[PDB]
Design a protein around this ligand. Sequence first.
Ligand code: HDE
Ligand code: HDE
Ligand SMILES: [S]
Ligand SMILES: [S]
Lengths: 726, 726
Amino acid sequence: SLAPEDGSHRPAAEPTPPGAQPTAPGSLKAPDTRNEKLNSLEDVRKGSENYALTTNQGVRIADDQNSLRAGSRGPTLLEDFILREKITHFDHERIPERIVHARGSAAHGYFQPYKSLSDITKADFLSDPNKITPVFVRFSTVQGGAGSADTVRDIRGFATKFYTEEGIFDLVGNNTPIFFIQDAHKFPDFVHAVKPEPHWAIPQGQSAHDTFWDYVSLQPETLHNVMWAMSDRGIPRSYRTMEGFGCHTFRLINAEGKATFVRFHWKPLAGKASLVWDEAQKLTGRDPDFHRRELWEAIEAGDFPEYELGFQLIPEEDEFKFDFDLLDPTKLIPEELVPVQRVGKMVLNRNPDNFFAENEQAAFHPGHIVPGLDFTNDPLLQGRLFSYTDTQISRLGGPNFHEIPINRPTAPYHNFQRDGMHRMGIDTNPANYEPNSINDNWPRETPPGPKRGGFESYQERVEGNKVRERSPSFGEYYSHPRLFWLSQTPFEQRHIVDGFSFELSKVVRPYIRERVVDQLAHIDLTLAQAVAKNLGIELTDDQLNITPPPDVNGLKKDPSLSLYAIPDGDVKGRVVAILLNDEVRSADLLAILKALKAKGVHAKLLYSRMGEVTADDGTVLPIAATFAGAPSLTVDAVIVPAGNIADIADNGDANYYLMEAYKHLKPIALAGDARKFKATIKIADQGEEGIVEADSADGSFMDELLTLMAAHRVWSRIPKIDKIPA
Amino acid sequence: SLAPEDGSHRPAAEPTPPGAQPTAPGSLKAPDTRNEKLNSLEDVRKGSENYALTTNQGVRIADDQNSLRAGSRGPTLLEDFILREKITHFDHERIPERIVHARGSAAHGYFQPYKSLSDITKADFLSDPNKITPVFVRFSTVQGGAGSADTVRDIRGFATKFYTEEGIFDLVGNNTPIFFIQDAHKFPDFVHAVKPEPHWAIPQGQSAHDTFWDYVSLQPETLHNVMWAMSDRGIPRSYRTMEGFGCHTFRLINAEGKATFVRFHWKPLAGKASLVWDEAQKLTGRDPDFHRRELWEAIEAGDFPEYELGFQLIPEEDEFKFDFDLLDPTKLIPEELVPVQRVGKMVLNRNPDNFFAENEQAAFHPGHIVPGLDFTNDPLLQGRLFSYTDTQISRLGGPNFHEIPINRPTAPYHNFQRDGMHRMGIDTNPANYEPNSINDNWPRETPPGPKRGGFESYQERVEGNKVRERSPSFGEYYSHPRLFWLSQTPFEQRHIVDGFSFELSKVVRPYIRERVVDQLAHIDLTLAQAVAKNLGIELTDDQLNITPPPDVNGLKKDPSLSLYAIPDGDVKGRVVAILLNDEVRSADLLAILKALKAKGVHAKLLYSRMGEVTADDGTVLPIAATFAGAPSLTVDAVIVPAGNIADIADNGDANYYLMEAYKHLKPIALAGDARKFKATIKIADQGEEGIVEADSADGSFMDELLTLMAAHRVWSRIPKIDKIPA
Ligand code: HDE
Ligand code: HDE
Ligand SMILES: [S]
Ligand SMILES: [S]
């Protein structure tokens, strides 16, 4: 017995806030959270308590501390089969990482539609509001390895595996509504350009290098998703606070055989929020696991990630009614033109048990559709259909990857396929071919029908010659970048300029920077000039006269493209740093902690050391982390209670905590004599918007703080930080 | 879509300083640099200029921009074999990363001994000072994935493949002289404990989490290598400025058959230097590729990494003469007791061409020895011999990994092994077995002897029963951690305390912290008290009375265990940031660059934007990076020349640049009105050791700065940095 007698090694099996208890496997943290998929995995879940340690062959091990040797200082013997099994398994633990989206964090949950969608699709999962579909979702970055950092500037993946009664449906989306390239044939060129360069394998998790910008400069189709990546969209606060999109026009197919074009949306019910660049970059160093950690802890805390599934629906007859081609994956469909219709709600409510087994081996692929859905001729989507099945053969070791437990359908599956590496299912069918008489032709084909029918493709008319040719309709590259730019707030536009400027400054060959600047001048002159100024580049008279691209169907902005133009803030699940001193005013802390609790906002009590401090009234205050150990990067706001301020007033880390949080536009609240820290961040006596201050933490001090937090960051402070040395 | 007319896309094929040219494949950067191994790879090197783009079958491609489809807006066709080859290759790019040391950076070079070692070993590569052996070296961290960051706190790997005339010898070392554990049977337990925890796969690149410290608290054998990891040895400045060690006692065997025990050492000719934790951690965010980059650039610049091979030699009759067991890999052999004998010099002078082909697929293994070397019964080394061959079967896809070009011996290899996946060699031998008459028994066994003989094991006597039992002589855990502790300077001790304090503060379960502090009390009470204080823990009376472990064979300290106690600075290949203004005083810059150049010290010119600024005399100065884009983390010292100081005096980034450099103990030099920045870092008029200042940058000013840089950091400043908010 090595566990502590007080049982403090084991986390409570109840929802607890971030940092209160060690984290655990989902079935141990939340044993009563169930769904049909989680239940169906019970056959392979393996426990441990009270069991004897064995080899894989079930042989009990007596000494797991020593190899077998001739004499206690002698050579190890080949007949040590316990040593060799154990080391063999270790020696083969690793499998190939995903070619792209290798870095990803995942969770189980469930989806339910708001109402039946039978008028527009025969998809069984969308047929009845009382139909619950288990999901498994993996969020990811794109470029970096499985051991790269979470808060890089990159697109994010948002993949949802729906375990439906009529088969697996994978909705394999991203956090922007378009992609960099038009045709799947170029995907290796694009990916190679953004990935670490091949001579030296640098840089990790970054597009800020020559080959990416070289490619972008020579392939203007990429400019739209580049605008998105350079904006604060490229640096989300949390997977809970970004949008999701299905990237392509697909089809819905109803029982009557009518096709409707659809683009898929996920709206984050926690709101849209992003970091700022300096914060995101520094955070890759201070906690490269920050998003994986935040997702896991939100789920353990009961702050379940929730998203609303939405559809943009376009009738068959309206295929050609836009300025852009619906099948072009570099074009978005503005919500002002085609609204998103609410469809249903997904809640992620349980972490996995074993990350490797459930997360690393999960296979998602957009060809996994079900009756009631179908594809289109989008030439990016068309190639994806090839890639996601082929790649599993090396990644997951062969064609039986659907038998890896997380991948298994909960719907029945029976067919005539046999064998392959790792074959688990033992087929008893006397036949392995059809048609057969020896088993009366079972399992049998099923006609298409309104429910429970076989899959049949929509009979779309095809007419043309066999060509390798880009549609002329796809040859417009600047209008959507422009629409995106004009839709952003002035502070968002500033962060876009700064992303381009920062990234191009890492491009070693100056001609590439110049070429990119030329492309910016084809989108918007103010943008092009601002980036040019940061790069010491002067636009030519010609570049000054490039006429801007047309409006998109008469639109000059669409506010749904902004993260922040329309408020959607939610504070629940956010976190506040509380900077302790050695004699805190206990009435300030009561008021602070209860107000945060009442709104679902977490707190972490920080100090210059671990252990405890004692408040004015003798209350013993447990310390979560030190100032340097849990930097302001990791919180949404900072509160300093009154008390013995002289304890920390000269602590460099405590001052720096506030400068860093100030620079990154976070709300800061100072009570009583904590107002002496005003001088550290240079705040005028009469105060400033975004700094909450009062004699004490009572009255409106906490409501004012929470109002700031609902608006995420203090954008008005941007001109003030510009000269802060932090 | 083509190269600029000025040819600026292509790096000069001459040595150039970091940042002067884009980096490039080694064979293009330094085509005249050769050795036998580099030449032998010519069969597989593939160029590209003037060649047609083809499928892998040699078919020229007409349109690499589009998929084949039925009409230009139609579905992609299955007969597009060009698309599917290209996509299939992409979909299968990744192979499993190494189970440990997945993150690593490699280069080519050569080794030669100083004199013949034939009195002690018959190894051919140590037999003649004029016999040059090609080497390929990979440096690594241990815990993190291939996409994790470089400047983590971790042990570093240092693996050298010697391509000798009598076979490949791989010396597979680390940058500390011991390991965490005693018996290879426990390697998977230790590695699992340090690696990301299995439920959520956090943390990456960090031992700062509950499972690692749980293991350490329960296995006091780990404490010696933990001491080393918590010291600044865990955060080297560069692979060029760390020591390497072979980890085990091996044997040398001479022609007469005499065995001598040996431990291997690499001495960095650029001297020993490490980061400080705050700097190392922030650098994982600002440049996760810093060590990989610095190595590649040092080789491009001609600052070739050089190491001296050294041997500790112990006669067979002295096996039992120390108070520790020679075969215990948790124990070091103090250089005060057994001096390192200089053996030869290794120079790394070319970067690879393709990181995947040469670095990622290289396989090193300590069982790859040659006649003249042999093993011992070290029970860690014993188990390693199983693992390094076994693991290659999944990692490199089969038993023909020696045919992968980087791995191939330059010495002849012929034997009766056949087949296996991706078999390259076509054997013509009528026989695939021996003995055979049908090929007159070729290839044939060769007797052992003085040179070019067959391998025979040294006939060590073995006497004991078949037991799984740890040698009693291995059961001492505290004396070597204490010797290490006592050998460190006071500032190195403070950093060790701070490493333990920071790490244990991230351990969520407090009892684990308490148990680690109790272990520390068995090593040194001063260390234990100082960690406990930081964790808010009070030592008990029993803990205060624990008797310190005994001295190691009479030693109270051994200064060769310290990074810094004995000066060994070398400034060549270091780098200074030079903070520009818009009217630099050219006279200052001229003298600065001249003094730096004379000592092989590089410079980076930084400003608040990219492009150019013009000096007082018309000199146009190109800007390498912005103050934010290349932070003081990345340089060794900072110089601010005179001129129009008002231009940058109020710049937040420029002021911060100095604050960060000051905090991290780096030399700072301020000329003319740049002395105004003294106010940002609180230097009194009188000045301060480690801040160089004068009316202008002259002979005297540069000499002082260069003197400080030879001592690496300004340790005496440590008391002054607590207060700086940076
Ligand atoms: C719409 C969102 C989107 C788009 C447009 C693309 N990816 Fe993804 N991807 C793979 C291939 C692939 C191709 C061929 C194309 C355009 C032709 C895209 N991508 C663009 C893949 C290599 O087959 C992939 C890697 C491993 C795997 O199983 O499939 C793959 C990954 C991926 C993910 C991660 C899913 C997961 O396992 O967590 C996501 C969210 C996307 N892609 C989105 C996506
Ligand atoms: C003393 C230097 C040292 C020590 C003591 C060990 N490693 Fe290493 N290691 C593998 C297995 C293994 C075992 C079983 C033990 C102790 C029993 C050690 N290690 C401790 C490996 C799985 O075979 C390995 C991973 C991938 C691979 O090809 O080999 C491996 C790697 C490794 C490297 C990396 C070499 C490289 O590719 O650059 C180094 C420097 C060590 N180990 C050193 C080492
Ligand atoms: S997409
Ligand atoms: S070792």
